[PDB]
């Protein structure tokens, strides 16, 4: 009777996307937990690198929170049984509050980390005298607090409704927007604009300035050989490639997600055909895959290039096994 509300897709694609999500879950939780332990172990001369290690700890914690808070619930009742919504009444809006607070936390952590890398490389002498560990802890708790308070419109706009043809039905219960279409359009536009356009602009501008400056330092070191010469230019080239990798991974991971939310909020009910319905749900699986890639690709960037960070990490895995 509620068969029109059902989403009908090929079940083997559901099995594939479930296996990909389990793989991303185990890799991301392992990477971010052992990243937090490795950043906890570092204890020798904390003056100004403790700032960046607190930023890396905040970013790994936010990715771990995206994975742990999001993956089981969205996996279960957005991939397998979206129809009954077995979780319940206030859990709908609480769950969107948690997911969107975690999304803002990861966005502002990558943005703040780019800000701190800019302060450390391009204006290096002022970063010691100006910024402090108290200043860094203030700034990190401030961006976590701002990520908490931005997600409150997603707490108001989301809620349970009963979209069955009948008034009461067990499978009728769904977890949708409840407020008027113009209002939820404003909320999704502000969410998309802030959580994508503001980090993408600051990441693009700052990481491009940093990569330009340390490519100038590459040209300087190759111009004028020394004892650490073939180590320094390799360090700087891998720094350039980390900066471009963070920018490109940010775009490729979080553009299709906001494209999905925006093409939800724009397209009116007259334009939806069942082709767009089915394309939306396959697009939903694809975009949440590209979304959960970003929670995993942060410890991979650190173990790739930092040789100090690599050894403590692989010894920590050797201690566990």
């Amino acid at each position: 009777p509620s068969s029109e509300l059902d989403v009908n897709t090929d079940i083997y694609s559901k099995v594939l996307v479930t296996a990909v999500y389990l793989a991303l879950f185990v890799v991301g939780t392992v990477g971010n937990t052992v990243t937090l332990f490795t950043l906890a172990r570092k204890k020798s001369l904390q003056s100004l690198q403790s700032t960046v290690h607190y930023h890396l700890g905040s970013l790994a914690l936010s990715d771990l929170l995206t994975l742990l808070l999001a993956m089981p619930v969205e996996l279960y009742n957005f991939i397998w049984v979206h129809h009954p919504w077995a979780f319940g009444d206030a859990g709908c809006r609480g769950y969107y509050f948690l997911r969107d607070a975690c999304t803002y936390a990861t966005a502002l952590n990558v943005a703040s980390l780019s800000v701190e890398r800019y302060l450390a490389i391009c204006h290096p002498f002022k970063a010691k005298t100006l910024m402090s560990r108290s200043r860094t802890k203030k700034f990190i708790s401030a961006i976590w607090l701002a990520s908490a308070l931005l997600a409150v419109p997603m707490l108001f706009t989301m809620g349970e409704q009963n979209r069955s043809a009948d008034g009461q039905h067990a499978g009728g219960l769904v977890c949708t927007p409840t407020i008027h279409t113009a209002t939820v359009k404003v909320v999704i536009q502000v969410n998309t604009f802030m959580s994508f356009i503001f980090p993408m602009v600051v990441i693009s501008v700052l990481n491009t300035i940093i990569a330009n400056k340390l490519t100038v330092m590459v040209r300087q070191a190759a111009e004028q050989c020394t004892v650490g010469g073939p180590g320094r230019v390799q360090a700087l080239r891998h720094g350039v490639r980390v900066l471009r990798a963070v920018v490109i991974a940010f775009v490729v991971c979080w553009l299709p997600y906001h494209v999905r939310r925006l093409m939800f909020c724009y397209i009116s009910d007259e334009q939806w055909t069942p082709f767009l319905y089915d394309f939306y749900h396959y697009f939903y699986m694809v975009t949440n895959a590209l979304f959960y890639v970003s929670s995993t690709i942060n410890p991979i960037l650190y173990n790739l290039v930092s040789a100090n960070f690599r050894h403590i990490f692989l010894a920590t895995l050797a201690c566990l096994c």
């Binding site: 949708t176 927007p177 909020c265 939806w272 069942p274 939306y280 939903y284």
Partner: peptide
């Protein structure tokens, strides 16, 4: 037929 999952 608007999809409802966001």
């Amino acid at each position: 037929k608007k999809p409802y999952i966001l």
